[PDB]
């Protein structure tokens, strides 16, 4: 699964997805965290 109650939303929900992308992308822009999980 990749959605909680997105179904409830008709079109507006779409915008939500877009926003999410930003956050995710930013993550790849800062792989520094890798060091943490790593040794």
Q: Do the domain assignments include residue 3? A: no
Give ∠ CA 30-36-3 in degrees, rounded to 5. 60
Q: Report yes or no on 7 lying in a domain.
A: no
Distance (Å, whole) CA 38 – CA 10: 41
Residue 36 CA to its chain's centroid (Å): 20
In a domain, 18, yes or no: yes
The approach used to solve this structure was: NMR
CA gap 12, 8 in Å, rounded: 10
From the centroid of its chain, how far is CA 10? 20
Question: What is the domain count for the chain?
Answer: 1
Q: Is residue 30, in this structure, part of any structural domain at all?
A: yes
Neighbours of 13 (CB within 10 A): 13
In a domain, residue 2? The reply is: no
Kindly report the number of other CB atoms within 10 A of residue 1's CB atom. Answer: 3
- With helix as H, strand as E and coil as C, how does the chain read? CCCCCHHHCCCHHHHHHHHHHHHHHHHHHCCCHHHHHCC
């Amino acid at each position: 699964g990749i959605h909680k109650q997105k179904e409830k939303s008709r079109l507006q929900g779409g915008v939500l997805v877009n926003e999410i992308l930003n956050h995710m992308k930013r993550a790849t822009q800062i792989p520094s965290y890798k060091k943490l999980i790593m040794y």
